[PDB]
């Protein structure tokens, strides 16, 4: 888990005009977002209030290191997803195409139309390259 | 360039009857079955109903001498013969099997049945030689082209004994006279029965259909009947019931469907007359992440029922690619591949398409008053983007990349940058270059960067670029 | 009848210096106690006799049994008996380096000098041969050969220092290669002078007569037990008195882990050989082998001197076991075997087996809660309470006020009780594959134990007729009558 | 050792309708008894009062792990005893018989009568098998 | 007089590229500083010269000195010089695997291609021979031989890639066996392209002239210290500059542990070879070996270039020691030897011995109160820790005679207060203080045998105290004068008799 | 390190008529002096007052172990000095002579007179042997 904590450490010190190592909740979000997350303003409160009883609004590492020590529990499936991505990508080109998305689907029962299919690709597609790369496949599976 | 049928089965090591019996399951369940090599000198023992070693026994089998086919306690009598570290690591494993599993596993003298000696004579492993009498006891020498040990067998009980040759020394630097050859055994109904190599499965690739069949008709419906997530509702019903694996002790890490697939394989063999229980005791090599074995020849049985034997790792990769991972079949490769396996520090490489097209970019730092550090610059993949049109995106995208092109990036002469970072950003730049031409060619980077001057808040140059769409 | 060597022939194989052995008969006899030694480097014997000092626990390098440095402790452990065994050599050297540093001025190394007589001794034993002469830097040398293939040895004519180098194209085990250089040997500091070391006498085991142990117990501390109305708390203090003065052992500073009587016996031994003339100091330097739990050595031939004064040499481990069984551990003599036996020695992962009667019985003896728990601990390497409790009920000292007839009954029941609270756990869920076996095991044991108590007086047969359903002093009523 | 603490851990969680891991002194005894001990009610107080200054009567592991870290000091002679057992058992049958108990005794000076001897066996004997097994030999040397 | 090679012959054995060595004379001379290099893979030399890049600290795989891959860094370390050494091979590979992963994109591996000229080079050196042709899947190959018995090598005619396989029935050290497959070699990333690596120039030690070190000291700071009264604090001032500017060293990011002047000298060296045409980059990548404390390498032949510009090659370690002694550490030049020497290097447990004067004289020197209290600690590793007071079994006794006095009396011997007395005085007061301690010690041994090794520690101190005293005495006029002295009644009185005794 | 703490432990228990392990500041100095140090009475106060807020004047190990854990920071140069000593000693006799002290000096710029030189030697010399041994060279560098 060295790298784990090591990762949370990298971003934490990336933005912190505090110096010693204490940020605010006005940026706590940006941190979790730059570190690959999309938390809702509702979740950024009920947590920064349970462990942070300081009432000062000051946050450091040991505190943050613990919050992440909870969220990263039933989501660390990074693996399973990455593997699934590879399952769609039959041609092994590194990207998921509509044709490919078709098979997986049809072979799972749901017979889709060339329309519906192309709809899913575009929806999941973020760069407009007309295909889904792992990074995209990831975002699409995150929420 | 792979062997087929008879010839391949010959090299697979599986007991013919068992393999034939396997075609049935491969076919019926439309799923590829891949086995790792099987000690050829173990085959016959297996067929004759000898029990196979499970995860509670890690000693390596032997492929020479009278004890060939079994699991010698003295691992220098195993296939690892002559490899000090392997022998030693092997023994410790046996010692452990003997102690941490008392009454479960044990060792017993090796007895070579009248028929076995014969089998060995054909295979040209040992030869029953001249007689010998030692304390009023009758023995018959058993030879082998080996130079360190000397073997003999008792006429009375048929126990085999061995000793080190004259002046010769064991790998571990030992030397001893005549003494029994002990072999790993498991407890069966209070009696200790000898063990032999099992059928270590390499991988299992089921017809994508099959994993569906696995899903409960209900949980599936609650997302397939236009509940459009769906797009991601499928993948997850694909993961939990097709990709997901978990520990299990008797068997190792594996998957529900795999577990089942196990049972059928086993049952499937009993029918041929196999007495000694199971031949497939645990999950596939693809989940053997701590001590991965990289074998040269893989034995594959396709859903057709044919027999194929890859000749070498590079080949096994192709086969899997062309006929499985690229043909609607469920497959995942050992997570240790392309990494240093923790256990034995193995470094087995495998083709990861994801790393294939790795000329892209995201949260790096994966690499590890007055707004200058803040701002939305490292978020190329802006989720909120399905609102734009495929054209806007590819158009805006390039912009975001270039945004990062000259971000805080041109900091190429901040104090003293190590060739390590530059290399990265460089590479990254080499990525952003290609991660654009594509968006372009779809519908027409070293095109026009002179028509770009970022010397102000990205918002100011935003209009610029949109005018550069020409 | 066992096949063991005797007298002269055995002494020959023991490695001890004859005079020393003879001298030992005296102590074995006088103190009525078996003395067992582990093999002794035969090429060390003469050196010992000539008064060379032996290695104590502050020196763990292994002696050599070949080449000019034979009999001594080469600094370069690839010149020792462990020659050619990379790991052993390496482990050997680290040990020497440690001896040299963690004990500065205490232990050191010095060039090996082969005295005029020693070369001769070696020639006879057929270890090395003084060969052709050689001159190298205006210096005179005489090659010394050996059937060895990696090294080449020569000796200086002036000071008689031996040097060695690796042969052409040949490589050391550790993957080294070098030319001419002195052969250093482990030495100890004696009166400011550094004197070379050699193999010592390692005691395999000391088996004294129970009586001899008695002499260790203080005359009124024993009476304060012997003379005690009670019987239970007596049999205890009598045992605890055996332990304290006979069994228990402790880690001494330099004598390793040995007991107190052993400490004495040790001194008598060193005394004995000094009366014969040994001027090197001690020949026995520490506790014995049965306490060498971290790195146990399993030797084939053990040299035994019985309280009679005779010499016996077991031929092989299995035999050494018999001897000890038939003539010691089964004939009123104090003896305890290495606690590592039947386990994986921590230090060298050795796995030496030995016959342990207690285990033998395990099959017919129900377990205590502790064992039952501790079996659930060491079964956690990869869940219900009435069982361990009941087992605690089976073994209740309260039973010392009842009659055997009573005991068996109450016990027989308590067993059947546990056999139930267990049977239903398996009737419950498989839980863990190996936990299932643990219970199929307990079951059998509980079975045997009970079935055993019963044939002592009158299992499943009487198991179909018993209650499960409503729990107090009632289900026990039917039983009472059932057994009659 | 690892197993040591591992053992104290097994029993501790064996009975604890608390959940998280906190038992009472109303059962603390049962625990130490199921784990192979016979402490007196007098000793179960002067200890649960020195370290437990909470005044709540709640006990957990780290606390218990320390108490045991004291008692198991001049009693860990498990070895010495087990060895002693083996010393009495001349026939190596795994059990201590009267005849055997005789020798050890007579050879240590105390000459006993066939009566007194059979008395000791019967006293130490707990199952009535007419012999002492290690387990029994243990209780007789501890309890 | 020492048996060391010189010039041409020595350079030949050094392994450095001639041009590079010549180029080095320049710096050695100009900066009046000895330069010492550890051996360099001879089969690496030519590769270096031809501009191949050398391996830095991010690559610990060992180079190869045989077979087609000779001179390079084979990924399969059994193809390196460590060939046939299971543990070394294994340790070697793990290192490569690490280099490949913990440094992605930085370091990598690539197929070994033997250029038309290289094969030739190899043929001369008699390393490999281009043999018979072979055709395998419609592909043309040419066997490459070597007197090796485990592997078999061949080269592709098309791309010139070399492949190897294990011989029939033969087994790898690691117990492997495989058919034809490419020989991968460690490489570094250069401008997006992966270029092969080779042995670098490892500096054994850099010995500069004290003066050259002076130039390192800021002329002002040298003044704020050379300009002051205190005659004694006069030296202590320069001593600390000498240190700060030439002795102290620090762990750099990629240059390992080196000093600052060394950092400079380093750059001059790489500069020098670039002036000759070396286009591979740096040829020297790290502090010197004397700071390589975790895994010290003890080489036989050291290549030295003296401030004169001459070439010397020590024949063996013992010799290298002499050379350094007679011409460097004994001739006004800055030098410090690996701190691991005479100790067990932590990393590889190496035990390289070196002559350390301080020790070579701690026999006639009295221990410090500290250089004593510390010993009592180490010697306390052969016993159990508890209470220093009351260590006896009897309750009537609770203290080892002269518990602390022995220490204090040692602290008295080394008292800076003595800087106001005369030598004649000093020796006297000291000679006594020693005899004082020799007493508070003698009675400890006269008291009980406390611990077997503690006894020796004192039989040792005794001798030392003895020698020291006896030494001070022969400076002017031991046991002889020990029978006539007091024990019995303790202030400024027992010291009175002594005064007269020495005269 | 182990030895470090091990050293501070040796002296600490050397003088302590307290028993359990608690000395006074009336001797704290003697300890640090016997352990190779020369602290000033001004420094023996501002420290024994920061960590020691007991107001009792009682000191133990854990406390002392921490004080040393600070002083031994920019002084642990023991190494550098020892090396420097070896630099002066050209003849490798184990002692520093005037002649030697001369060179080092003159080669560093400061040209000294046979008088001034012999002055430094005597000053640094503590035994009067007419030369400086490492031990002395040490005191002179850390008084
Ligand atoms: N799913 C899994 N979990 C854990 N370990 C596994 C798994 N699958 C495979 N392994 C590891 C080792 O499999 C048994 P092992 O006995 O080492 O095979 P083998 O090497 O083929 O035996 P052999 O030596 O008898 O020929
Ligand atoms: N009581 C003990 N305490 C510690 N170590 C012991 C004890 N008893 C035995 N040993 C271990 C090793 O005894 C010394 P060791 O030098 O290893 O003997 P050896 O191997 O017989 O010597 P040799 O190599 O000189 O032939
Ligand atoms: N100052 C230093 N600090 C740290 N490590 C050092 C220092 N000086 C040397 N080293 C450590 C390793 O040096 C490089 P390495 O490449 O392993 O040498 P080598 O074994 O001679 O190379 P070769 O295998 O390429 O022939
Ligand atoms: Ca695709
Ligand atoms: Ca895309
Ligand atoms: Ca018995
Ligand atoms: Ca009984
Ligand atoms: Ca000098
Ligand atoms: Ca002096
Ligand atoms: Yb297996
Ligand atoms: Yb010994
Ligand atoms: Yb290097």
Tell which residue, C240, C249, C204, has the closest CA to residue D84.
C240
Please tell me the experimental approach by which this structure was elucidated: X-ray
Q: What backbone phi and psi angles, to 5 degrees, belong to E237?
A: -70, -50
Q: Which CATH architecture has domain B351-470?
A: Up-down Bundle (1.20)
CA distance C221 to chain E (A): 19
What is the sign, positive or negative, of the torsion defined by CA atoms of E429, E434, E439, E444? Answer: positive
- The reply to whether ligand 3 has any atom less than 6 angstroms from the CB of E281 is no
Sheet of strand B299-301, all strands in order from the earlier edge strand to the far edge: B3-4, B307-309, B299-301, B31-35, B201-206
Residue C134's H or E segment, with its range, is: strand C129-135
What is the sign, positive or negative, of the torsion defined by CA atoms of E99, E101, E107, E110? Answer: positive
Q: Do E349 and C94 touch (CB under 8 A)?
A: yes
- The reply to whether ligand 3 has any atom less than 6 angstroms from the CB of E286 is yes
What is the whole-number distance in angstroms between the Cα of residue D133 and the centre of ligand 7?
Answer: 5
CA distance C194 to E194: 58
Q: Write B216-221 long-range contacts (CB < 8 A, 24+).
A: B220/A109
Please identify every residue whose CB atom is under 5 Å from ligand 11, which is an ion.
C 200, 202
Task: Return the number of other C-beta atoms located less than 10 Å from residue B414's C-beta.
Answer: 9
Q: E146: phi > 0 → left, psi -120 to 50 → alpha, else beta; which? A: beta
CA distance B363 to B380: 9
CA distance A141 to chain B (A): 6
Q: Which CATH architecture has domain E41-199?
A: Alpha-Beta Complex (3.90)
Residue count of chain E: 503
As annotated, the binding site of F for Ca(2+) includes 16, 18, 20, 22, 27, 52, 54, 56, 58, 63, 89, 91, 93, 95, 100, 125, 127, 129, 131, 136
Instruction: Judge whether B421 is closer than 8 Å to chain E, CB to CB.
Output: no
CATH topology of domain E355-503: Butyryl-CoA Dehydrogenase, subunit A; domain 3 (1.20.140)
Q: Do B172 and C85 touch (CB under 8 A)?
A: yes
Instruction: Judge whether E1 is closer than 8 Å to chain C, CB to CB.
Output: no
Task: Return the number of other C-beta atoms located less than 10 Å from residue E388's C-beta.
Answer: 21
Q: Do C253 and E452 touch (CB under 8 A)?
A: yes
The β-bridge relationship of strands C193-198 and C53-54 is parallel
Q: In sequence order, what are the residues at sequence separation of 6 or more whose Cβ sits closer than 8 angstroms to the Cβ of residue E333?
A: E33, E34, E207, E208, E209, E210
Tell which residue, D96, C211, D121, has the closest CA to residue D113.
D121
- The reply to whether ligand 3 has any atom less than 6 angstroms from the CB of E42 is no
Torsion of CA B363, B368, B374, B379, to 10 degrees: -10
> Over the Cα atoms of chain B, what is R_g?
31
Burial (Cβ within 10 Å: 0-12, 13-18, ≥19) of residue B59: buried
Instruction: Judge whether B367 is closer than 8 Å to chain E, CB to CB.
Output: no
Tell which residue, B131, B331, D122, has the closest CA to residue B142.
B131
- The reply to whether ligand 2 has any atom less than 6 angstroms from the CB of C63 is yes
Torsion of CA E460, E463, E468, E471, to 10 degrees: -150
DSSP at A92 = -
CA distance B150 to B178: 9
Burial (Cβ within 10 Å: 0-12, 13-18, ≥19) of residue C433: exposed
CATH number of this structure's domain A1-74, picked from the four choices 3.60.15.10, 3.40.50.20, 1.10.3720.10, 1.10.238.10: 1.10.238.10
Using an 8 Å Cβ cutoff, are B398 and B381 in contact? no
What is the sign, positive or negative, of the torsion defined by CA atoms of E480, E481, E484, E487? Answer: negative
Using an 8 Å Cβ cutoff, are C426 and C436 in contact? yes
**Cα separations in angstroms, B365 against A36, B403, B435:** 10, 17, 20
What is the whole-number distance in angstroms between the Cα of residue B356 and the centre of ligand 4?
Answer: 11
Q: Do C434 and B98 touch (CB under 8 A)?
A: no
Residue count of chain F: 143
What is the sign, positive or negative, of the torsion defined by CA atoms of E292, E298, E300, E306? Answer: positive
What is the whole-number distance in angstroms between the Cα of residue C191 and the centre of ligand 2?
Answer: 25
Give the helix ranges, DSSP H, for C104-259: 116-125, 210-214, 219-226, 232-242
CA distance B126 to B68: 9
Tokens 């061949």, located at residue: E154
- The reply to whether ligand 2 has any atom less than 6 angstroms from the CB of C65 is no
CA distance C408 to B429: 86
3-class secondary-structure state, position A9:
helix
Checking chain F for breaks where C and the next N are over 2.5 Å apart, the residues before them are: none
Please identify every residue whose CB atom is under 5 Å from ligand 9, which is an ion.
F 125, 127, 129, 136
Q: Where are the beta strands (DSSP E) in chain F?
A: 95-96, 132-133
Q: In sequence order, what are the residues at sequence separation of 6 or more whose Cβ sits closer than 8 angstroms to the Cβ of residue D95?
A: C361, D89, D129, D131, D132, D133
Using an 8 Å Cβ cutoff, are E107 and E187 in contact? yes
Q: Is B58 designated active site?
A: yes
Q: Which residues pair with E107 in a beta bridge?
A: E188
Atom of ligand 2 nearest to the CA of C295: 11
- The reply to whether ligand 1 has any atom less than 6 angstroms from the CB of B187 is no
Q: Which residue of B has its CA nearest to E101?
A: B339
Q: What burial letters (b/e) apply to E435-467, b meaning 16+ CB within 10 Å?
A: bbbbbbbbebbeeeebbbbbeebbebbeebbbb
| Helix, strand, coil tally for chain D in percent (to 5) | 55, 5, 45
CATH number of this structure's domain C355-484, picked from the four choices 3.30.70.3270, 1.20.140.60, 3.40.50.2300, 3.30.1510.10: 1.20.140.60
First to last CA, chain D: 24
Which among F10, F13, F102, F105 is the top mutation candidate for probing chain E, defined by the most E β-carbons within 10 Å of its own β-carbon? Answer: F10
Tell which residue, C328, C259, C239, has the closest CA to residue C36.
C328
Q: Which CATH class is domain D75-142?
A: mainly alpha
Tell which residue, C227, C204, C197, has the closest CA to residue C59.
C197
Tokens 């956690």, located at residue: C380
Q: What backbone phi and psi angles, to 5 degrees, belong to B453?
A: -140, 95
Using an 8 Å Cβ cutoff, are B123 and B76 in contact? no
Q: Do B381 and A135 touch (CB under 8 A)?
A: yes
Least CB–CB distance from E451: residue in C106, C192, C253: C253
CA distance E362 to D28: 61
Residue whose Cα lies nearest atom 3 of ligand 2: it is C256
3-class secondary-structure state, position C251:
strand
Domain extents in chain B: 1-38+198-331, 39-197, 351-470
Structure tokens at C138: 């205006």
Tell which residue, C483, C299, C302, has the closest CA to residue C406.
C483
Task: Return the number of other C-beta atoms located less than 10 Å from residue C441's C-beta.
Answer: 17
The β-bridge relationship of strands B51-52 and B191-196 is parallel
Residue whose Cα lies nearest atom 20 of ligand 1: it is B60
Task: Return the number of other C-beta atoms located less than 10 Å from residue E224's C-beta.
Answer: 10
CA distance A122 to chain B (A): 7
Q: Which CATH class is domain B39-197?
A: alpha beta
């Amino acid at each position: 888990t060295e790298e784990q904590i090591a990762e949370f450490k990298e971003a934490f010190s990336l933005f912190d005009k505090d110096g010693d190592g204490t940020i605010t909740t006005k940026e706590l979000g940006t941190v979790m977002r730059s570190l690959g997350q999309n938390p809702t303003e509702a979740e950024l409160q009920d947590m920064i209030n349970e462990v942070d009883a300081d009432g000062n609004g000051t946050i450091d590492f040991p505190e943050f290191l613990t919050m992440m020590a909870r969220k990263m529990k039933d989501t660390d499936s990074e693996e399973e997803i990455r593997e699934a991505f590879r399952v769609f990508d039959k041609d092994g080109n590194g990207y998921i195409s509509a044709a490919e998305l078709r098979h997986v689907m049809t072979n799972l029962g749901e017979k889709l139309t060339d329309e519906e299919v192309d709809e899913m690709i575009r929806e999941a597609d973020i760069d407009g390259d007309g295909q889904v790369n792992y990074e995209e496949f990831v975002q699409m599976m995150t929420a | 360039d792979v062997l087929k049928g008879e010839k391949a089965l010959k090299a697979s090591g599986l007991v013919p009857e068992h393999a034939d019996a396997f075609k049935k399951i491969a076919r019926e369940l439309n799923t590829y079955i891949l086995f790792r090599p099987v000690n050829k000198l173990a085959t016959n023992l297996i067929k004759s109903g000898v029990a196979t070693k499970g995860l509670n026994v890690h000693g390596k089998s032997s492929d020479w001498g009278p004890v060939a086919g079994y699991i010698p306690f003295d691992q220098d009598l195993s296939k690892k013969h002559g490899q000090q570290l392997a022998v030693e690591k092997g023994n410790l494993e046996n010692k452990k099997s003997i102690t941490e599993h008392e009454g479960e596993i044990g060792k017993i003298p090796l007895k070579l049945d009248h028929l076995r000696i014969e089998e060995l004579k054909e295979n040209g492993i040992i030869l029953k030689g001249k007689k010998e009498i030692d304390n009023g006891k009758k023995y018959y020498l058993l030879e082998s082209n080996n130079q360190v040990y000397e073997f003999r067998i008792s006429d009375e009980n048929n126990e085999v004994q061995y000793k080190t040759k004259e002046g010769k020394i064991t790998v571990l630097g030992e030397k001893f006279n005549w003494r029994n050859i002990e072999v790993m055994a498991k407890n069966v109904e209070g009696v200790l029965k000898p063990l032999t190599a099992d059928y270590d499965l390499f991988a299992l690739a089921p017809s994508l259909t099959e994993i569906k069949k696995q899903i409960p008709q209900k949980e599936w419906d609650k997302v397939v009947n236009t509940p459009n997530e769906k797009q991601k509702g499928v993948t997850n019903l694909l993961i939990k019931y097709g990709i997901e694996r978990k520990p299990d002790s008797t068997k190792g890490t594996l998957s529900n469907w795999q577990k089942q697939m196990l049972d059928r394989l086993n049952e499937a063999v009993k029918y041929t007359g196999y007495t000694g229980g199971d031949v497939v005791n645990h999950g596939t090599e693809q989940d053997n992440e701590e001590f991965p074995e990289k074998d040269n020849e893989i034995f594959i049985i396709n859903p057709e029922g044919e027999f194929i034997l890859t000749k070498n790792w590079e080949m096994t990769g192709r086969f899997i690619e062309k006929n499985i991972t690229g043909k609607d079949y469920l497959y995942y490769f050992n997570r240790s591949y392309n990494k240093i396996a923790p256990g034995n520090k193995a470094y087995i490489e495998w083709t990861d398409p994801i790393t294939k097209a790795k000329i892209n970019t995201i949260p790096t730092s994966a690499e590890f008053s007055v707004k200058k550090i803040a701002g939305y610059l490292s978020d190329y993949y802006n989720s909120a983007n399905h609102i734009f049109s495929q054209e806007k995106k590819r158009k805006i995208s390039i912009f975001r990349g270039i945004q990062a092109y000259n971000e805080i990036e041109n900091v190429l002469k901040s104090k003293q940058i190590a060739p390590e970072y530059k290399n990265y950003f460089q590479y990254l730049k080499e990525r952003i270059t290609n991660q654009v031409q594509l968006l372009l060619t779809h519908q027409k980077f070293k095109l026009l960067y002179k028509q770009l001057n970022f010397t102000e808040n990205e918002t100011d140059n935003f209009e610029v670029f949109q005018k550069i769409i020409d």
